[PDB]
């Protein structure tokens, strides 16, 4: 699955647009079809295909790696590769198979409090592209107070009238075509899908592999640092895609730390020279970015660089 | 003109509420008799013998409405703070509004209607001079309800300092006693004393 | 070159929080203060404090590179090092110094059509930080239906009723602290406030320097590709921080594309061996990424990577 194939699929979907429908997932985990009207469907669909075209079609700098090779980079749709599928993944794969004559409708008396997920189903090239987004904390809109009797008040305040009306903004979190998933907003993946247990499991698996590598005297700072998900995503990246763990022996990494111009100053070596000392959070993140193979030296100007975002060219 | 003048006229009508209460207490010819032969004379002559309590009653509801608007000017905004550099109390400028401008009205005799036209013209003339008199924050009705009128010199964190502002507030203030503003005009703001 | 100064400044701003003021800017380029309700303003202050805590205070992966060093990384605040301040930045620095007794309040009878951007003046410890936002045409938030005949209305007819309510989300596009500007969303720069002219002029200067360097044979394809602003930004980053243009010679660049594994396949040499044959768009973007030193090689693993985002260490 390459980026150009996904671009061609999205272009064929958009250039042969046929239909549009909106699905809701509530807190009791059922799919209910909404009653959103046709002119509003046309406006929302035009804006959403505009967002897709600015995000996929007219975007000329898309790369699509996996979430196990995660790094903090913009303008990229991370393809799902993990084995365990969350429950909302099952809900959206049921949602693309919902028949057009389904009578499971949405009750409008729920005050939009039960609904926690919105589904945009665009249709093209006999395909149903699914966009899943959530509901935020209403992202509150403001109304000028036209409440003397009907229509005057050029002195009133801006205050929140409805406090229940859903927004449906021009933003999506994840999108799926076929059995292929891509995630743009990973924050709602981590907190709302409750994915942080899986990332913590990969983190303690990578910590056990670090203990098997015989490289660290004490992982207590790494243990108390792995509870935050920011260290845990890089721990999962170390667990899966690191070319240092399980491939390079301990003495080579210690020797390369020893003659390095910046790693020798912070990541100190112990008295016996058999392991590497790590206690501070600066040394913690430096060990994380060292094991992730990011201290990379130029072959032309011989300048060492910190690569936040890297991609393999030969694969 | 207009809006600033209307705000100052509203503050002046708020300043006169105790006068309307005093006139209603003073010259209401209500037959307060518990006797059995004290039947109702009728609504028409009860209205006609109590003309100036009726007029002062209408003006009292106008003062209540302008107090409601002065509370509406602090309802909406007022989520920013400043620092006070020079606080000098000026609550006594409220009280000299009482004993010179409201006290001598009760010495008058509100019996003949020509004299009442003269006193209404005096109220209107005092109001016209009091709009532009730069001491329009004087208030018996506001200073009755716990409010104190101070002369402060606030200092903003990002814009700078501004001199000679008048702060209507609910609690006592001093130097370095950060407050929230709810600015009414370019002269008078309502403080709140962020603790 | 570090991020600790802004972190300390935002710690003093948020930890000694004093107040918040909302200032609207207008399409006729003047500032009008707003009339926000106090409970809703307290909610806005709490949410913006929470967002600036989740992005600056609680964040650990936050880097602050230069805007001239534009790369495609996330969690990056770009420092405004350009020599020309646009109009809205001057309006922000005017809006900081608005005295609190000002009476040019906004008129809600304008129905929120003349407002272009929303400025939020979050203040703390005798300093003022100004966040900025764009009114994104109401981002087409659909609304529910409350039919006149009854109060619950059990019939789904959800349409956007007023079309004039203000959105005011919790995502800020740029901000200012002290006398310095930091930039989050560069699409706000390019589309709204028209920053692309200076970038196109810098791309013109880059093309002049590329003509004078005599590395390329035909520059007409690059001059055609310079029209796109997504290419003009990286031509500007070539014009400012290319580490191999003007510091090393052309012959070692020819050798470096000659004996490279990937770059010999696409970036072709001419028959005279002195100028490159770069005509296609893939060869064009490979030429640009080679100017940014993105074909970047490891030392411990000795693996060539495609460095999308990189920095010159020095933490």
UniProtKB/Swiss-Prot annotation, chains A, C:
Disruption phenotype: Cannot be deleted in a Kiwa-containing strain of E.coli. One of its GO terms (biological process) is defense response to virus. Signal peptide: none annotated. InterPro entries: KwaB, KwaB-like. It holds the Pfam family KwaB. Keywords: Antiviral defense. NCBIfam families: KwaB (NF041623). Component of antiviral defense system Kiwa, composed of KwaA and KwaB. Expression of Kiwa in E.coli (strain MG1655) confers resistance to phages lambda and SECphi18. This is Kiwa protein KwaB. It comes from Escherichia coli O55:H7 (strain RM12579 / EPEC).
Swiss-Prot record, chain B:
It is found in: Cell inner membrane. Its main location: membrane. The chain crosses the membrane at residues 10-30, 46-66, 117-137. GO terms for biological process: defense response to virus. It is a multi-pass membrane protein. One of its GO terms (cellular component) is plasma membrane. Disruption phenotype: Cannot be deleted in a Kiwa-containing strain of E.coli. Keywords: Antiviral defense, Cell inner membrane, Cell membrane, Membrane, Transmembrane, Transmembrane helix. InterPro entries: KwaA. Component of antiviral defense system Kiwa, composed of KwaA and KwaB. Expression of Kiwa in E.coli (strain MG1655) confers resistance to phages lambda and SECphi18. This is Kiwa protein KwaA. It comes from Escherichia coli O55:H7 (strain RM12579 / EPEC).
């Amino acid at each position: 699955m390459t980026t150009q194939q996904l671009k061609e699929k999205i272009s064929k979907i958009i250039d042969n647009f046929s239909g549009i429908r909106v699905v809701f997932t509530t807190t009791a985990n059922e799919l209910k079809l909404s009653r959103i009207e046709g002119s509003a469907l046309n406006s929302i669909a035009e804006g959403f295909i505009d967002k897709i075209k600015e995000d996929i079609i007219n975007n000329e700098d898309l790369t699509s790696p996996l979430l196990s090779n995660f790094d903090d980079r913009k303008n990229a749709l991370f393809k799902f590769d993990y084995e365990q599928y969350p429950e909302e993944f099952n809900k959206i794969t049921q949602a693309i198979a919902i028949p057009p004559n389904s009578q499971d409708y949405y009750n409008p008396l729920n005050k939009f409090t039960d609904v926690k997920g919105i589904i945009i189903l665009i249709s093209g090239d006999n395909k149903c592209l699914a966009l899943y987004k959530n509901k935020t904390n209403l992202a509150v809109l403001r109304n000028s107070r036209k409440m003397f009797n009907l229509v005057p008040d050029p002195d009133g305040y801006l205050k929140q009238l409805p406090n229940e009306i859903l927004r449906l903004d021009f933003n999506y979190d994840l999108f799926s075509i076929g059995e292929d998933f891509y995630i743009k907003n990973h924050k709602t993946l981590e907190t709302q899908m409750k994915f942080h247990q899986v990332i913590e499991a990969q983190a303690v698996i990578a910590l056990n592999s670090l203990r098997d590598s015989l490289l660290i005297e004490d992982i207590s700072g790494l243990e108390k640092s792995s509870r935050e998900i920011s260290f845990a995503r890089k721990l999962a990246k170390i667990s899966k895609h690191s070319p240092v763990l399980g491939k390079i022996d301990t003495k080579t990494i210690i020797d390369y730390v020893s003659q390095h111009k910046y790693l020798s100053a912070i990541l100190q070596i112990n008295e016996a020279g058999d392991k590497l000392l790590i206690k501070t959070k600066t040394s913690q993140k430096h060990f994380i970015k060292l094991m992730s193979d990011d201290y990379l030296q130029s072959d032309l100007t011989k300048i060492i660089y910190m690569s936040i975002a890297k991609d393999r060219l030969d694969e | 003109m207009q809006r600033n003048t209307y705000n100052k006229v509203g503050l002046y009508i708020l300043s006169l509420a105790m006068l309307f209460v005093f006139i209603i207490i003073l010259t209401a010819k209500i037959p307060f008799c518990f006797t059995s032969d004290c039947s109702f004379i009728g609504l028409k002559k009860l209205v006609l013998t109590n003309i100036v309590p009726i007029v002062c009653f209408v003006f009292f509801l106008f003062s209540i409405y302008f107090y409601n608007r002065l509370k509406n000017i602090t309802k909406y905004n007022g989520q920013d703070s400043v620092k006070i550099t020079s606080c000098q109390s000026e609550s006594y400028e409220s009280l000299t509004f009482l004993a010179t401008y409201i006290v001598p009205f009760m010495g008058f005799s509100f019996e003949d209607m020509q004299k009442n036209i003269a006193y209404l013209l005096l109220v209107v003339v005092i109001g016209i001079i009091f709009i532009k008199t730069d001491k329009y924050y004087a208030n018996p009705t506001l200073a009755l309800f716990g409010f104190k009128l101070y002369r402060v010199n606030i200092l903003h964190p990002g814009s700078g300092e501004t001199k000679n502002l008048i702060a209507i507030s609910n609690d006592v203030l001093k130097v370095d006693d950060n407050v929230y503003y709810s600015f009414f005009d370019e002269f008078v703001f309502i403080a709140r004393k962020k603790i």
